[PDB]
Amino acid sequence: GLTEEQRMMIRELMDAQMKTFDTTFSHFKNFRLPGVLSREEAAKWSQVRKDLCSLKVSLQLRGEDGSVWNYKPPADSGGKEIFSLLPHMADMSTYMFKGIISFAKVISYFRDLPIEDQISLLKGAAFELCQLRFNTVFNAETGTWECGRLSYCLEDTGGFQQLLLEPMLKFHYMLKKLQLHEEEYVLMQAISLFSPDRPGVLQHRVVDQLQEQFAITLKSYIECNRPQPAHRFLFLKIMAMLTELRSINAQHTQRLLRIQDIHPFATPLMQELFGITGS
Numbered sequence: 001g002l003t004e005e006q007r008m009m010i011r012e013l014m015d016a017q018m019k020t021f022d023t024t025f026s027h028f029k030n031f032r033l034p035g036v037l038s039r040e041e042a043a044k045w046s047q048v049r050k051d052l053c054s055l056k057v058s059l060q061l062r063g064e065d066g067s068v069w070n071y072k073p074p075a076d077s078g079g080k081e082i083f084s085l086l087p088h089m090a091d092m093s094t095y096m097f098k099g100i101i102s103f104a105k106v107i108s109y110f111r112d113l114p115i116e117d118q119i120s121l122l123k124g125a126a127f128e129l130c131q132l133r134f135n136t137v138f139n140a141e142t143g144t145w146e147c148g149r150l151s152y153c154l155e156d157t158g159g160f161q162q163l164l165l166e167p168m169l170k171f172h173y174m175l176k177k178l179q180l181h182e183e184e185y186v187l188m189q190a191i192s193l194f195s196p197d198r199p200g201v202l203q204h205r206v207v208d209q210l211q212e213q214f215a216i217t218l219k220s221y222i223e224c225n226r227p228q229p230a231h232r233f234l235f236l237k238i239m240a241m242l243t244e245l246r247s248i249n250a251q252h253t254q255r256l257l258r259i260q261d262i263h264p265f266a267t268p269l270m271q272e273l274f275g276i277t278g279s
């Protein structure tokens with residue numbers, strides 16, 4: 001029951017996703033790994049500890065030869081050990097950000113925007129699109145993001161309910177429970193990417209019209225393909241999660257800048273996307 005334009009729109013988005021989402025992470029290489037073996041500033045450190053303590057994961061690397069490396073992070077002992085996985089995660093996030101920049105650039109609707117708006121939209125949405133792609137490799141039964149030969153497992157710290165307190169973790173579990181199709185994930189990416197109210201966007205009206213068309217396409221897709229009672233209000237649930245994801249983006253951006261202030265680690269691409277000039 002989709003129009004021809006809506007069908008073409010999903011086709012273009014799915015093409016872009018297929019071309020730019022390395023779901024096996026085969027080309028993620030040469031990344032860093034954790035090493036083997038005042039008053040104003042003290043308040044900053046206390047906040048940064050809170051920014052990180054509920055986001056801890058262990059890391060597993062499965063070798064092509066069948067070997068397995070496993071890393072368990074240190075406990076918070078008041079020192080720099082809370083940062084041990086940040087270079088690695090900066091490298092993974094940077095890899096993902098390159099993929100979502102590539103995703104945007106192959107979409108006609110994005111390519112046709114002024115280059116300054118393209119940059120403003122990617123700066124605005126990079127974390128959101130990255131997390132949406134990460135949700136598709138999230139295993140909610142094991143609390144693990146399965147990234148090809150790499151796995152990131154939430155540290156069983158509190159318990160299951162106490163871990164749902166962290167908004168980005170609650171988001172991953174809640175989104176996984178909706179059991180979305182690839183097409184619904186890629187339309188979520190489009191709706192996030194074409195957000196007319198990101199800082200710096202000049203073509204507000206064009207971007208707003210584009211976003212509405214992606215949202216209408218998603219609404220129509222769901223109506224045409226999901227008649228089951230479980231999917232009543234699914235479109236509205238998804239849109240509400242996209243609004244929540246924008247809020248989480250702002251909050252994790254604040255965490256990033258707080259950490260960067262006392263412990264610089266952002267890669268050059270992260271600096272460009274999240275507003276760090278190099279002073």
Ligand SMILES: CCOP(=O)(OCC)C(=Cc1cc(C(C)(C)C)c(O)c(C(C)(C)C)c1)P(=O)(OCC)OCC
Nearest residue numbers: 055057089090092093127134145152168252253255256
């Ligand atoms: C705003 C920029 O954030 P960011 O890309 O930065 C890279 C360091 C970032 C990325 C990130 C976040 C999560 C949570 C939040 C779902 C736990 C992950 O599970 C993962 C992996 C790689 C393990 C799948 C990466 P951040 O939210 O979490 C990493 C600690 O970083 C905010 C400081």
